[PDB]
Design a protein around this ligand. Structure first.
Ligand code: FAD
Ligand code: FAD
Ligand code: FAD
Ligand code: TDK
Ligand code: TDK
Ligand code: TDK
Ligand code: MG
Ligand code: MG
Ligand code: MG
Ligand code: NA
Ligand code: NA
Lengths: 585, 585, 585
């Protein structure tokens, strides 16, 4: 006849297909805990060691599977600890439900222990942000929160006074709307607009197709269009892997987490097809200042003409539109622009290989990533933290459509490596999972290495120990007048941290040590987590946004200093290849 | 003729006497970093490993010295990481300035990398919350923020677009108002009201004086009034130490972080003098339901009649008022109420001593704290985390007016032990400093053990490893119908964590191991930090709020179960002593 | 045994002495209405015609009496209509309680009719901002709101779900803390700081005392210090009347709502004693750019050194400090500085009198205000709207300590004239009350002239009809490159509007009509409200901030143009008087 309101809430989560959720208990959320306890055969609670890891893992769940992530925090400090993960979910536009403990309705507004008005705390981050005040409507409020988080691709927060889930409600009244769920409709491309777009693209002297993760379903069409039309491809960093890295006309990404060929080509291009792309550097870096025609395909009307004035804009699904272009074109002959870019890519990849292929000496980030490549399975998943690792992984990882990689794309919160890998292994127990993190980021969430141990999640953790916030040191080098500050710090031995949480680990500092240690790690991670602490040099990775290679643009002295510092003696500027094929810079 | 606006900002901090500040750099705050770098001889930047530790340490600075604490975080995730420390500062009403990075005014509102409207993030926590938009007024905005944080005893947040501090401003225009600073005026007690208050207090059959930290300047007057009038003393937990723990009529604190004699006496009292006290449990625990007359002294009109209806309310300084009462009274003879309470205290202290005085066997929290007492200097400072340690430290630490102790009093954020100890050692390098933390709380901020190492801060860290969130397990025992959940977890060896950050450490699990390890730690902390990981039992500490000792109130079976579980065979209920002296319960 | 929670809420209001409150009913607040309906003998509900008028009137109640003002609005649009009054109360730092309707707890968060999360709406304006969720604690929440509004001198907002006030609660539990309310007894002003401040003031060659409303209790001391020491007085506009306008050495106020002698003298002064003053134009107008020493007295630490670099800032009560200064000084002979300022004031007053004393012709604001003066009782209260009326009333009204005048000082919301006058008459039925308003501001709240009729509040309304937003037209003349826009509009005949709400009224457009109309109005307002619609010219009043009178500073052409436009042929610059008494400019 009756059900506890907390039991009904957990049944709402189950109806929506929530497999696992994260948090840390407290008095203010013990009634939800009680309902979870009864339901442990059907829904799986993951106890983290810091609530930010719970929120970040919930975000990562949604990034990986498209299913809403769920986390919770107790009243006051439990909930405020969620913030970095909630902001990550907002900025990366993935659905997350966050439940926040609150003291009982009889004690609210009495200024009792750890009791405050919690609603204003979450107003900025959340698409939906409500304090529940009734037990009978609580299942509906949770249902509403989930349905909105999905529809609006963001964060729904519900503060729950602890008395409500222990109250009996009628067993027959509540329901979940999960059965009625659908994903948004995919708009179709206008035939005339697609034809006009195709004509402009074909008439270009120096075309590029520049796609983001909005094109994640269109890898085949992107590569086929590139091959057929002889048009180079470039992408946002997160869109690495949609087309295989091995594709010879994939230039990489632009700006800083970037590859040289992409920056150079973008500066020269006359027509850009900008597809499923919200590149946040467009305006500030003047990326498109010399672009003659700008053609955009996006599903979101809020994005059309956002990053540059459009000459043709198509409000449609990326794959449907790219298919429609491909359907109306035929094989084109090679062009000077095509060949110049192909040559430039070859030159760049030879540079990266030269760094990877060192066999002995002081360990650099480049060989560590080569060692990752050597033990990586074809469908491996990479959880990547924030800093130099984004740049280095972007250059060195050899990804295909079979891979996944995730980071904090836009909020760019450090510490996401560990939680992202926890979520990855929970969602894909049979797939190999890496956590690639700098020492600064790994330090921030280090305690949750214990969570990998506790739940026997065989993540391969690789920490890049430079004893610096390298990403920031390099920024200070570029901008600051006075000495470095706050960017060089004391060593932490992560192999000892790992030992502390009862995880097998290794520490290495020489290139020649890599093969055996990585082989051992590969084997250990068949059953248990493992950590490799790679002590790397303070060498700055080549700044693709600050090239000093072209004698028509840089002094002979700046060029040779750049070659020496970045081991880039064999790099040629794009202009070399443009000139070979009869085009001017 | 000109000065960089960032240089002027740092000069404002120097004028206000800021010695040290905390944070982690980033591109969005590198211009403030540049100004700090130039000023490193005069103001001292402390690089933390997680920004929440910076915010918590800033809060602790203000708790300890009364001087505004200063922290910062980079745009987006740097700033949102500050939240647990900022909420701590708000709820514990201490002045803190937080600077938040923001991207340059040319890139704001362009939806660029890690760029968002940051002002709404801080609206709830902050007394003052502004985004600076001009370089010439920036020193004033910082000055304003500091002056308001002090006057309003809370958090001032300023978001700073990174371009502004690198702009030149006239050298002669800016100023700091530090020279004009004063603390609020101390109101004087009305003579007639004090006399009426004194008469009511003297006419009481079962009086208590119940003080909080608002009486921190009135220790001498409190103890003297108690001795002269034969009136027992009780306090809030944070007010432990204002009167020496050894004082035989100090009952301790009420509720849960509490001592038995205080809970029992409060239930029986007819008149309570409530002084400098904002006890958050007053209403929810029905603390004063049987109190006949309620007399209050507080400096804040917002507090008068807040926690119970007052019969006499005095808007005045605690010390001035207590002095005025003492001036108009003379020595009173002993009473039955006085003797019953004295006997009860003796019985309770003998119980605590019996726990402390065990010499061998499985290690409990009680002997760990005895070992702390044995190596503690008379003016030691204690930074205490959140959980069972608050209860255990409250019972076992032997404090006097010469000590300081701090925790997160009201927000009660876990993880404060480490940052509180960092702040304590920075402010009091010649005083012994302890960090007393449970394993859950220590885990949350563990990475900043590295900060103690980096800045050579000789903190004595003591971790209470029960492999539980014990405080929460006990709550689930009390309230939950279904099995424990999320409260028992895997071991972390903190002696290995310490080794990882290059700190000397010990792990112990037997009572007989304590003396030598604590002696070694005492010696090490003359020069360097040290950590003791104390592996303790899962024994629940005696619940002072759930006594089962009085046969007129509890079954014989519940009483003997309580004695057995809490080793409390020799405890007597207050009623025993009331009856001895001819008073009924 | 039991009491309705709504009934207890009204008893809390009665305990705090709330005489009257304002609002408009709705379904979402009908349970509070129900409780008010039973208590008509003890609390007086005023039904307004627009909720902003209720909020503005509540703010005005507190401005006038120092007692908390109370208003309410129904859920959604009722509450949001309060905003202009709530912001006025926040900015003018007066205590106001606002009750906001909400739908019942069973329908909250169901997305029902007019149902939304109302808490974020009031977060910015409110010092205290909570949604009640329990009936038994509702009286406490209201009590807390009141106590906080008083303590923090601002707005407390409580959102009340409509079901709660109809729930029975135990009769014996609730209480109000009004009985605890008191004002603090302060120590004497800091003796050594006051002595030093005094020496600096007396050593000055060109001293000024510049006070604001913080000196409201110090009129006697201000005038005596001025006379004894030969130091001219100037004030903020709202501080007009604290010293009688007829005082020969009262210079007026500075900036734009200002008088010529104050602006001229301030520019010359070497030492300013800034007392109970938070002049918002200090920095932006560079008011103190030439000041050698700046001395301050203020009760609020947040203000110490806020507006200018301050040589000595005394934290103390204005009256007590000024009395302490007076007690340690004695007579100084007349100085050139004193004589020059006296002469300048005389010249300025002759100018104002020349405008007032016209007897025939096109009506100007100047003669209307002379007509007000001629019918004004010595203790009349003036509610003044926002625009040219602030400037003209500041110059022409002849106020003494027996008067009161109020406007929206800092938020400066138009429309306040009508509600301020309603509040004034409710608090002071036996005092004459004027509403002096421009046509723009009167139009915004015109419907509430019906409220004066409904409650038989004999306000004398005087509307200054120029068919312009004159204040803004003048700004456009000063700053805008293109034609006037939005500042000249169609006539509204307010005598006809008055007829429509059943109020006796007159319309005048000639100077010679004034005496008979104002005599009739004076007599009508012995019993009923009345309105005079004064059709005035579009003449720009003399801009005290743009003086062109001094041959050393302005071209002869500029001076002749200024003199012509502003009928200022007989005005002399201060430099003329300075030279006369042997001082240089
Ligand atoms: C430390 C760090 C540094 C970084 N620096 C760089 C850098 O230098 N270079 C770089 O490239 N990135 C960088 N980033 C990542 C960067 O901040 C952005 O997140 C990224 O460039 C945006 O990628 P995106 O447009 O693919 O994704 P999003 O911003 O998520 O945009 C996806 C777009 O696709 C659209 N879309 C979605 N579905 C469809 C569909 N079915 N059909 C059509 N359109 C669809 C959406 O409406 C949206 O406009 C960095 C990240 C980090 C952590
Ligand atoms: C895990 C945990 C559990 C806790 N549980 C308990 C518990 O069971 N029991 C317990 O007691 N505490 C407990 N607390 C602490 C608790 O939450 C409160 O912070 C504490 O009880 C309030 O102490 P207080 O009134 O001294 O301090 P505050 O809340 O800071 O109040 C100080 C008061 O003094 C007034 N004041 C300031 N200056 C003066 C002056 N010069 N003269 C007069 N008045 C002045 C202020 O206006 C204010 O009202 C716990 C804390 C933690 C971390
Ligand atoms: C259209 C319009 C135009 C305006 N333009 C002008 C203008 O040109 N010129 C002008 O002068 N005004 C002008 N104002 C008014 C102006 O905006 C400010 O409100 C006013 O100048 C500030 O006056 P104040 O300092 O007296 O009041 P407040 O800002 O209320 O300051 C009071 C001060 O006194 C202190 N205080 C309070 N009690 C005590 C005490 N017991 N002892 C000591 N200190 C105490 C307070 O802490 C505070 O610092 C205008 C208003 C309007 C509506
Ligand atoms: C009613 O309040 P509460 O829930 O009892 C309280 C005091 O708020 C606590 S206490 C607590 C357990 C602390 O565990 P520890 O292992 O550090 O200590 P212990 O085992 O009790 O010695 C948690 C998780 N929380 C909840 C909590 C969660 N997350 C953070 C950041 N802070 C908290 N404090
Ligand atoms: C312009 O953006 P940014 O400042 O360059 C950026 C990307 O935001 C970074 S990157 C970064 C350094 C990361 O250091 P690591 O040691 O982990 O990596 P690395 O040494 O570069 O290999 C910091 C501190 N921040 C700032 C930062 C601070 N705190 C958090 C929680 N996240 C951040 N991400
Ligand atoms: C710099 O401040 P400001 O813009 O000069 C100021 C004081 O804020 C004014 S004054 C003003 C004109 C008032 O016109 P009236 O006809 O009432 O008066 P007047 O013609 O000047 O005698 C307006 C529209 N505003 C703007 C205004 C608009 N709307 C509201 C509700 N209040 C305002 N006050
Ligand atoms: Mg690093
Ligand atoms: Mg524990
Ligand atoms: Mg007008
Ligand atoms: Na951490
Ligand atoms: Na209106």
């Amino acid at each position: 006849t009756n059900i506890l309101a907390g039991a009904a809430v957990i049944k709402v989560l189950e109806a929506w297909g929530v497999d696992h959720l994260y948090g840390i208990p407290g008095g203010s959320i013990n009634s939800i805990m009680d309902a979870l306890s009864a339901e442990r055969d059907r829904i799986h609670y993951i106890q983290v060691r810091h609530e930010e890891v719970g929120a970040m893992a919930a975000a990562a769940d949604a990034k990986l599977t498209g299913k809403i992530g769920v986390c919770f925090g107790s009243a006051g400090p439990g909930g405020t600890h969620l913030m970095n993960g909630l902001y990550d979910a907002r900025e990366d536009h993935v659905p997350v439900l966050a439940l926040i403990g609150q003291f009982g309705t009889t004690g609210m507004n009495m200024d009792t222990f750890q009791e405050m008005n919690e609603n204003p705390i979450y107003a900025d981050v959340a698409d939906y942000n409500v304090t529940a005040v009734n037990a009978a409507t609580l299942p509906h409020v949770i249902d509403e929160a989930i349905r909105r988080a999905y529809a609006h691709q963001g964060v729904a927060v519900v503060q729950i006074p602890v008395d409500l889930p222990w109250q009996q409600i009628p067993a027959e009244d509540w329901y979940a709307s999960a059965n009625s769920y659908q994903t948004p409709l995919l708009p179709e491309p206008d035939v005339q607009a697609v034809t006009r777009l195709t004509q402009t693209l074909l008439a270009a002297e120096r075309p590029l197709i520049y796609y983001g993760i909005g094109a994640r379903k269109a890898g085949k069409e992107l590569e086929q269009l590139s091959k057929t039309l002889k048009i180079p491809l470039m992408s946002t960093y997160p869109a690495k892997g949609i087309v295989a890295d091995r594709y010879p006309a994939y230039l990489g990404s632009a700006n800083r987490v970037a590859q040289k060929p992409a920056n150079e080509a973008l500066a020269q291009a006359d027509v850009v097809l900008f597809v499923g792309n919200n590149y946040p550097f467009a305006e500030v870096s003047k990326a498109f200042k010399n672009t003659r025609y700008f053609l955009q395909i996006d599903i979101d009307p809020a994005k059309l003409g956002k990053r540059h004035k459009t000459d043709i804009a198509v409000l449609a699904d990326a794959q449907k539109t790219l298919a429609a272009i491909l359907a109306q074109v035929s094989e084109r002959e090679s062009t000077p622009w095509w060949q110049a870019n192909l040559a430039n890519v070859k030159n760049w990849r030879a540079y990266l290989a030269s760094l990877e292929d060192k066999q002995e000496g002081p360990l650099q980030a480049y060989q560590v990533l080569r060692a990752v490549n050597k033990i990586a399975e074809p469908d491996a998943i990479y959880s990547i933290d924030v800093g130099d690792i984004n740049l280095n992984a972007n250059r060195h990882l050899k990804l295909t459509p079979s891979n996944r990689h995730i980071t904090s794309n836009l909020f760019a919160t450090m510490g996401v490596g560990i939680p992202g890998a926890i979520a990855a292994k929970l969602n894909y127990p049979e797939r190999q999972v890496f956590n690639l993190a700098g020492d600064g980021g790994a330090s921030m969430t280090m305690q949750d290495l214990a969570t990998q141990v506790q739940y026997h999640l065989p993540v391969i953790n690789v920490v890049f120990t430079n004893c610096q916030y390298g990403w920031i040191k390099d920024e200070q080098e570029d901008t600051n007048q006075n000495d470095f500050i706050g960017v060089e710090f004391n060593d932490i031995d992560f192999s000892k941290i790992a030992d502390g949480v009862h995880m097998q680990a290794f520490r290495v500092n020489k290139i020649e040590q890599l093969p055996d240690v990585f082989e051992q790690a590969k084997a250990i991670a068949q059953h248990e987590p493992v950590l490799i602490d790679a002590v790397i040099t303070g060498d700055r990775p080549l700044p693709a946004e600050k090239l000093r290679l072209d004698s028509a643009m840089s002094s002979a002295a700046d060029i040779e200093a750049f070659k020496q510092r970045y081991e880039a003696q064999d790099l040629q500027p794009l202009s070399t290849y443009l000139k070979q094929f009869g085009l001017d810079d």
